[PDB]
């Protein structure tokens, strides 16, 4: 009906943390990962206090363990007042601007400048980010280049004239700086030059807090041939705080299936929950997530209400997973190109 629908992270209302940042076993759409959600909440109090510039935290761990789910939990826990720029790591490879300029625009999008104006007397509020100020003052009719995105490289001299004016306003009280977050997911997709730009961009006084997520192991960096942990050089890994994410147990995988069967609005039998937890422990968590909705449609075509174990076994025979898919490809490897 609306533009929004049931996505992969639509069940997560936030990190289920109490007053003492201690994580609850199942709260606000999140379950498991107790040291990772507690470290995410300490980073959440660091973002809400706004005092320290340029802090950086890597969320590392295995695929399917919820690195991105912790990041959209902290994204809904901030609210719309604090900016949260969420980019992919492949988005910096632009044809109209350099990777340094694309990372500088992603850095300056996350620093909100709340300007008030008293204008018989009404205080209009124009919250705006530092990137919009640099695009408006970059040229005449530059305010449509936020919209169409056809800004080139903004000059560095222009950015020092905006940073100085904003410092002046802030000391005169006309503006309030609300520093924010920059989530670079799949950061492993950045090259050595962009990682070395991150080595000096995080030392700036106006840098946002930089969260990053990587499922990669001790691999090669994209611009070079050396092997380093997480695909990230040790020169940048000196500047971060790693948050590991543990693989799930049986009861945690089963409780991810009950919070998801609710978001997709499907009523499942308890025997089908045990068989789907056994499927989700044998192969993958995300394969058992996508079996829930297609099992609900097999239950709708038989005109039942409760999803049985036979709907799970029929949809398990209908759609394969990499493991079984790769096996079948072994035979037609001379048929496959």
């Amino acid at each position: 009906t609306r533009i929004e629908r049931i996505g992969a992270h639509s069940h997560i209302r936030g990190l289920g943390l109490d007053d003492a940042l201690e994580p609850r076993q199942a709260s606000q759409g999140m379950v498991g990962q107790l040291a990772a959600r507690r470290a995410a909440g300490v980073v959440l109090e660091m973002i809400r206090e706004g005092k320290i510039a340029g802090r950086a935290v890597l969320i590392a761990g295995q695929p399917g363990t919820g690195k991105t789910a912790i990041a959209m939990g902290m994204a809904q826990a901030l609210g719309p007042d604090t900016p949260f720029t969420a980019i992919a790591g492949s988005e910096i490879f632009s044809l109209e601007m350099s990777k340094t300029e694309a990372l500088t625009q992603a850095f300056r999008r996350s620093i909100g400048v709340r300007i008030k104006e008293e204008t018989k007397r009404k205080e209009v509020v124009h919250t705006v980010s530092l990137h919009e100020i640099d695009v408006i003052n970059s040229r005449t009719q530059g305010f449509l280049a936020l919209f169409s995105g056809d800004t080139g490289e903004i000059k560095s001299e222009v950015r020092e004239q905006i940073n100085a004016k904003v410092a002046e306003w802030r000391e005169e009280g006309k503006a309030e700086i609300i520093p924010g977050v920059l989530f670079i997911d799949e950061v492993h997709m950045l090259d050595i030059e962009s990682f070395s730009f991150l080595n000096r961009a995080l030392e700036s006084d106006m840098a946002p807090v930089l969260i990053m997520a990587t499922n990669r192991g001790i691999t090669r960096i994209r611009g070079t041939s050396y092997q380093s942990p997480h695909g990230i050089p040790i020169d940048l890994l000196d500047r971060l705080l790693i948050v590991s994410t543990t693989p799930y147990s049986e009861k945690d995988t089963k409780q991810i299936l009950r919070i998801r069967c609710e978001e997709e609005d499907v009523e499942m039998s308890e025997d089908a929950y045990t068989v789907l937890t056994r499927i989700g422990l044998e192969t993958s968590l995300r394969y058992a997530i996508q079996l829930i909705t297609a099992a609900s449609l097999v239950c709708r075509k038989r005109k039942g209400t409760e999803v049985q174990v036979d709907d799970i076994k029929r949809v398990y025979s209908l759609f394969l997973d990499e493991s079984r898919s790769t096996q079948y490809m072994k035979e037609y490897q001379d048929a496959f190109l």
């Binding site: 629908r5 992969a8 969420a86 490809m329 190109l337």
Partner: protein
């Protein structure tokens, strides 16, 4: 008259009321597991409840992968948007490759504003954004267009019709396009995407020789559902040659049908279905209204399959250029 192309006989999946696949219905023959799995996917696209789910059709070439997705497009009709897209289309000289993926992701979600008009989210994106040039449209524009479409739903002027994106030839994407597709499939506004590949256990482009199944990395293969497509039997090959003969208007004798079935199990399914129209033109050159075995035998001497041409290339490799 309209031109007759490949997949012109495909008029939807051949399913009954119970959702099981018929052996021969609506131009589709065989492949019953893939057709019930594609019918469960059609029900998802119509439930209009989910977003960003991803399907991979996998199998050998010539096994009904583009045909099964065009049967999905015929079962949805023209009301649901469908956005076919080759995976080699992302290397534009004007914009970055993730912008070509994002513009195709917004092209597959439709809005019917009412006097009735049909528009996509990408049409509103280029309307609210000299030589014309494609521009890398920011997420700053896309969030307020999403708020404007949400206000258009709440006053009742508009109705959203989420659709499907077919990224045929998904192995031609590079590793940056797969890693942006992780974030693209994780959104609550993304269209249901059907990917297709026939390039099992090959290297990802953009990487220096790491190997994954289907040309797709294992971190994207975690997020998709696999539908395999098992090869056809001799009997079903003859039924495809019979359906392509009725679609192209070609009468055929049963002995020429048995000879074209032996030719199609000898080489491939596609070489025998392109032996139909040249044998029909040779039959109208001879003046006979139907194809006999001598027309298929003469046309099969005139045109070669790829394996016989590779045998000619292996026997005479010193003469050809390298």
């Amino acid at each position: 008259t309209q031109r007759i192309a490949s997949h012109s006989h495909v008029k939807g999946l051949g399913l009954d009321e119970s959702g099981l696949a018929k052996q021969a219905a609506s131009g589709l023959v065989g492949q019953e597991n893939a057709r019930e799995a594609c019918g469960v996917i059609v029900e998802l696209i119509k439930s209009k409840k989910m977003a960003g789910r991803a399907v991979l059709l996998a199998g050998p070439p010539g096994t009904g992968k583009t045909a099964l997705a065009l049967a999905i497009a015929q079962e949805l009709g023209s009301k649901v948007p469908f956005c076919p897209m080759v995976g080699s289309e992302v290397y534009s000289t004007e914009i970055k490759k993730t912008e070509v993926l994002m513009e195709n992701f917004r092209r597959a979600i439709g809005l019917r504003i009412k006097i009735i008009q049909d528009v996509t989210l990408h049409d509103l994106d280029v309307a609210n954004a000299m030589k014309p040039k494609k521009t890398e449209i920011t997420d700053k524009l896309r969030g307020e267009i999403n708020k404007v479409v949400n206000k258009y739903i709440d006053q009742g002027i508009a109705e959203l019709v989420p659709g499907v994106l077919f990224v045929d030839e998904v192995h031609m994407l590079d590793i940056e396009c797969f890693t942006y597709l992780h974030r693209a499939l994780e959104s609550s506004i993304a269209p249901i995407v059907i990917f297709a590949s026939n390039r099992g256990n090959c290297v990802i482009r953009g990487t220096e020789d790491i190997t994954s199944p289907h040309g797709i990395p294992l971190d994207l293969l975690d997020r998709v559902m696999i539908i395999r497509t098992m090869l056809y039997t001799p009997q079903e090959m003859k039924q495809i040659i019979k359906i392509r003969a009725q679609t192209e208007g070609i009468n055929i004798s049963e002995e020429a049908l048995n000879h074209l079935g032996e030719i199609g199990t000898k080489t491939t399914l596609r070489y025998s279905v392109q032996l139909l129209t040249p044998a029909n033109l040779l039959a109208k050159i001879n003046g006979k209204d139907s194809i006999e075995k001598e027309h298929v035998e003469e046309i099969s001497e005139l045109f070669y399959d790829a394996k016989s041409s590779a045998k000619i290339l292996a026997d005479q490799q010193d003469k050809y250029m390298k």
